[PDB]
Design a protein around this ligand. Structure first.
Ligand SMILES: *[C@](O)(C(=O)NC1CC1)[C@H](CCC)NC(=O)[C@@H]1[C@H]2CCC[C@H]2CN1C(=O)[C@@H](NC(=O)[C@@H](NC(=O)c1cnccn1)C1CCCCC1)C(C)(C)C
Ligand SMILES: [Zn+2]
Length: 201
């Protein structure tokens, strides 16, 4: 048995900022502070204006990224689980959930802009991090790329759910995991955009 009246609900994922890629300079903007984020996670009611393609999102314990592609805001299952996302009308249920792909998605919030999937086949990629660094990555397989400049794994913490882009700024993948050796990230693992496209039909 258990006491049902005291069973808690998981909070919603909350948009707390964005990585601004609109100009000549990439930079992180915060749109909600910690107290606001906590309240909004509980109510699921977020009246803030959303802008841009890459959102900074938070659960109760973690902060990471979510990326709009083709009208869906995507992130990683290992970060978001099955959580709703906060919105002006209250919590919004996931439109896609796939633990096997490590992928989730919600309808893209009004005001967001979407990336278009890459069609050029370029293996010269750019990873956008949660601190708005744009890091060159050479594609090494369907779901792997090598960092041109290896970094401590700390550099990539919080970037899960962010985009890998081709030279034309189209979406190639969603960053999911670092391949690390003695704390140094030499490569990255990602969910290829073709996998998102199959999920969408
Ligand atoms: C991302 O979720 C994030 O931004 N999280 C912060 C809290 C909000 C995070 C970004 C990492 C820089 N991703 C992860 O933590 C992923 C997820 C994927 C499912 C489990 C976790 C683990 N993870 C990783 O990136 C890990 N990497 C690995 O487990 C790789 N293995 C190794 O690096 C390794 C090293 N020595 C011996 C054996 N293995 C594997 C390699 C094969 C492909 C998948 C990843 C860590 C260790 C956290 C970087
Ligand atoms: Zn492209």
């Amino acid at each position: 048995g258990s006491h049902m009246a005291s069973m808690k609900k998981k909070g919603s994922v909350v948009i707390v900022g964005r990585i601004n890629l609109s100009g000549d300079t990439a930079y992180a903007q915060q749109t909600r502070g910690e107290e606001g984020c906590q309240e909004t996670s509980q109510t699921g009611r977020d009246k803030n204006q959303v802008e841009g393609e890459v959102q900074i999102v938070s659960t109760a314990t973690q902060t990471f990224l979510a990326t709009s592609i083709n009208g869906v805001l995507w992130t990683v299952y290992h970060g978001a689980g099955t959580r709703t996302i906060a919105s002006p009308k209250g919590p919004v249920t996931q439109m896609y959930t796939n633990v096997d792909k490590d992928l989730v998605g919600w309808q893209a919030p009004q005001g967001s802009r979407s990336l278009t999937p890459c069609t050029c086949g370029s293996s010269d990629l750019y990873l956008v991090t949660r601190h708005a660094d744009v890091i060159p990555v050479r594609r090494r397989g369907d779901s792997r790329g090598s960092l041109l400049s290896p970094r401590p794994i700390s550099y990539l913490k919080g970037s899960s759910g962010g985009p890998l882009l081709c030279p034309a700024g189209h979406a190639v993948g969603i960053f999911k995991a670092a391949v690390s050796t003695r704390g140094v990230a030499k490569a990255v693992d990602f969910i290829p955009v073709e996998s998102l496209e199959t999920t969408m039909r």
